[PDB]
Amino acid sequence: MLEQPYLDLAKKVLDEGHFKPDRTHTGTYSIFGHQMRFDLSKGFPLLTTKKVPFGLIKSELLWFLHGDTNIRFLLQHRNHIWDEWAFEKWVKSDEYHGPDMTDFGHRSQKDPEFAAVYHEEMAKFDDRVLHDDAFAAKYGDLGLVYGSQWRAWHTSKGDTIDQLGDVIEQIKTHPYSRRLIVSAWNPEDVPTMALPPCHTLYQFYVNDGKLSLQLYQRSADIFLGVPFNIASYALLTHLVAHECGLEVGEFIHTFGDAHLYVNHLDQIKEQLSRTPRPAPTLQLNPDKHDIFDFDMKDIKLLNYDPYPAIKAPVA
Amino acid sequence: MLEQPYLDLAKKVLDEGHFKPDRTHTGTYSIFGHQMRFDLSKGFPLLTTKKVPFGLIKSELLWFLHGDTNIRFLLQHRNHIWDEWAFEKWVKSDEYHGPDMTDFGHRSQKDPEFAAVYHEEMAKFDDRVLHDDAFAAKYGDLGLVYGSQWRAWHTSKGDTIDQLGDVIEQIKTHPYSRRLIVSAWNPEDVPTMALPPCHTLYQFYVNDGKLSLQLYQRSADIFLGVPFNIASYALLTHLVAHECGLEVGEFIHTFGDAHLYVNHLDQIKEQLSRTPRPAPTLQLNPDKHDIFDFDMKDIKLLNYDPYPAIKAPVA
Ligand SMILES: Nc1nc(=O)c2c([nH]1)N=C[C@H](CNc1ccc(C(=O)N[C@@H](CCC(=O)O)C(=O)O)cc1)N2CO
Numbered sequence: 001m002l003e004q005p006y007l008d009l010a011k012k013v014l015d016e017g018h019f020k021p022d023r024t025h026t027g028t029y030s031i032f033g034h035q036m037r038f039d040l041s042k043g044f045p046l047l048t049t050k051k052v053p054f055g056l057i058k059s060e061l062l063w064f065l066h067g068d069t070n071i072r073f074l075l076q077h078r079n080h081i082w083d084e085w086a087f088e089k090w091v092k093s094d095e096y097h098g099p100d101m102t103d104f105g106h107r108s109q110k111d112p113e114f115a116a117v118y119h120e121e122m123a124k125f126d127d128r129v130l131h132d133d134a135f136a137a138k139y140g141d142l143g144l145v146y147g148s149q150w151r152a153w154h155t156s157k158g159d160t161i162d163q164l165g166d167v168i169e170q171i172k173t174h175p176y177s178r179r180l181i182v183s184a185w186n187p188e189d190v191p192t193m194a195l196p197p198c199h200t201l202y203q204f205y206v207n208d209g210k211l212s213l214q215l216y217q218r219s220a221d222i223f224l225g226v227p228f229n230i231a232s233y234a235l236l237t238h239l240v241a242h243e244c245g246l247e248v249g250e251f252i253h254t255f256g257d258a259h260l261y262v263n264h265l266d267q268i269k270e271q272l273s274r275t276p277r278p279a280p281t282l283q284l285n286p287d288k289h290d291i292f293d294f295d296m297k298d299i300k301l302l303n304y305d306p307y308p309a310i311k312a313p314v315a
Numbered sequence: 316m317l318e319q320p321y322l323d324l325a326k327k328v329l330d331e332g333h334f335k336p337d338r339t340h341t342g343t344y345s346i347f348g349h350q351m352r353f354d355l356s357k358g359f360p361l362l363t364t365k366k367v368p369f370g371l372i373k374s375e376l377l378w379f380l381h382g383d384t385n386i387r388f389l390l391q392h393r394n395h396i397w398d399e400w401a402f403e404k405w406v407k408s409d410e411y412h413g414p415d416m417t418d419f420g421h422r423s424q425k426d427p428e429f430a431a432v433y434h435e436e437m438a439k440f441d442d443r444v445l446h447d448d449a450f451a452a453k454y455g456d457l458g459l460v461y462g463s464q465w466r467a468w469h470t471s472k473g474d475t476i477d478q479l480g481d482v483i484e485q486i487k488t489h490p491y492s493r494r495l496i497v498s499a500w501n502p503e504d505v506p507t508m509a510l511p512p513c514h515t516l517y518q519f520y521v522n523d524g525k526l527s528l529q530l531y532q533r534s535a536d537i538f539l540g541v542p543f544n545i546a547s548y549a550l551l552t553h554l555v556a557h558e559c560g561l562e563v564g565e566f567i568h569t570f571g572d573a574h575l576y577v578n579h580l581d582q583i584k585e586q587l588s589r590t591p592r593p594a595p596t597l598q599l600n601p602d603k604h605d606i607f608d609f610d611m612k613d614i615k616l617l618n619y620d621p622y623p624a625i626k627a628p629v630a
Pocket residue numbers: 052053081082084085105195224225311314315
């Protein structure tokens with residue numbers, strides 16, 4: 001079946017998985033070094049063994065693709081995955097007075113009955129970055145996030161590098177190059193950073209008219225984080241394949257620390273007793289070819305019929 | 316046997332290998348996406364199926380390790396691997412007059428009886444960058460090469476980043492981090508560059524007191540280039556393992572375009588009819604622990620007994 005490299009990954013984290021200490025320390029079974037391979041010509045790689053929302057996949061990827069850094073497109077697209085970083089830095093200094101989130105995520109994860117303050121204060125904040133322009137401009141611009149790595153790398157003598165747009169020139173100009181890489185790993189910025197990019201590096205590759213893409217992810221969340229990660233870069237591989245007028249080959253997912261938090265252990269086993277169903281397929285707008293000027297409804301998924309979703313604690 | 320991930324790689328480039336057009340176009344059988352794994356606790360990974368000079372491995376790696384960019388340490392260490400870049404840019408503009416190398420490598424590869432000019436002119440040039448300081452300073456400093464990526468990354472507001480030295484702090488400070496990466500991929504510099512780094516990215520990892528290292532190499536030369544590449548980063552993994560007082564785990568070699576030039580085809584088959592012999596072992600100086608202040612004779616290889624070497628055309 002198609003998402004079986006994955007199910008196997010989770011089986012292997014469990015079976016050869018070493019027990020780790022870690023930054024978020026709940027604990028983690030981890031392996032080091034792991035490659036998976038998905039043929040995208042046999043179907044779109046989103047998981048049929050659990051309801052994954054493809055809608056959050058698309059809006060997060062087109063944010064990136066527009067080179068955006070503002071949490072407002074995302075909220076304005078019902079998409080909240082990145083709120084806690086900009087909210088982390090709204091709790092910042094000035095302006096903010098009242099109540100008091102003095103490291104919050106983990107605290108409503110060793111939960112109070114207070115969670116409603118946290119979320120009636122978050123709904124105050126998500127309203128302001130999409131009503132107030134001023135607000136949004138200073139408290140919604142995450143800064144360095146993936147849209148400004150791919151599409152606007154800052155140079156030592158003032159400029160910005162759209163590296164994505166230049167590689168897309170490079171596949172159209174010279175299919176057969178071995179230098180086709182986009183990197184979010186920026187040395188000076190990484191000891192400051194909040195999250196140093198989990199999806200470090202990628203390389204496209206052409207052969208015989210179909211492109212493959214390979215991904216290096218330095219840390220991975222096997223249960224909650226990898227399923228989503230699999231569909232972002234494989235939608236990006238059909239999108240770029242669409243713009244250069246090229247077919248689709250494989251998505252190769254190389255990992256560095258792949259890890260199962262141990263409180264997901266019972267959930268990972270459940271979905272492992274499920275049987276994969278046939279893959280979903282992807283339909284893109286066949287008129288519109290500048291993917292950078294794509295919106296939501298241009299990307300479409302046909303017949304995705306999942307098993308039920310497995311909610312399990314982590315955020 | 317230990318170097319068998321490799322032999323298998325070459326077998327697979329041959330068997331599933333797609334035929335490519337390429338930059339150096341002689342031609343190439345290429346695969347896309349390939350991971351190999353070497354347990355360094357069962358022996359040092361240099362090839363017993365052909366005499367690989369470990370002496371060029373060590374001097375190239377300690378150049379890097381001192382953060383050097385000058386071709387003189389290397390020559391002064393009988394090591395010529397990088398001459399053609401600095402010589403390429405001695406043929407540059409001014410100074411150089413006489414004879415005339417108007418893209419040379421490939422020309423004494425579609426050979427004249429002229430090769431002696433090329434090399435009596437190269438022996439003029441290797442003499443000057445190690446007698447003349449002035450010479451060496453402007454025509455030997457390659458610039459951006461791996462020693463100035465690892466150890467002195469230039470920042471947008473004036474400074475330099477020793478990223479290697481800071482990760483080595485990070486393994487000593489916090490073994491268990493998932494952010495332990497060194498990258499030679501620098502966006503602004505890559506469309507200028509001569510060779511954009513073939514060895515893009517690496518990530519160290521600790522588990523249970525032994526470190527692993529994972530490597531992303533965007534393009535690879537399977538026959539002439541990969542055997543050497545395997546031993547540089549696996550010597551680096553025993554060196555760093557030595558400095559943090561840590562054991563040695565595995566070297567993981569992830570690849571992007573792995574490719575066999577077709578004129579090496581007959582040679583790759585020859586060594587594939589050879590039988591691997593037991594692995595070589597590595598001895599490091601047990602007093603000296605600052606690997607950055609290592610020289611040659613501190614690194615040692617015990618009982619490396621190869622098959623004969625397979626010279627085959629490419630440079
Ligand atoms: N504050 C923060 N915490 C994070 O978990 C997080 C973040 N920022 N920055 C980006 C990533 C994204 N991580 C996430 C972790 C899990 C889910 C998740 O479980 N998805 C659910 C939805 C459930 C929900 O959010 O309640 C799914 O099953 O669909 C979302 C984002 N990440 C890492 O530092």
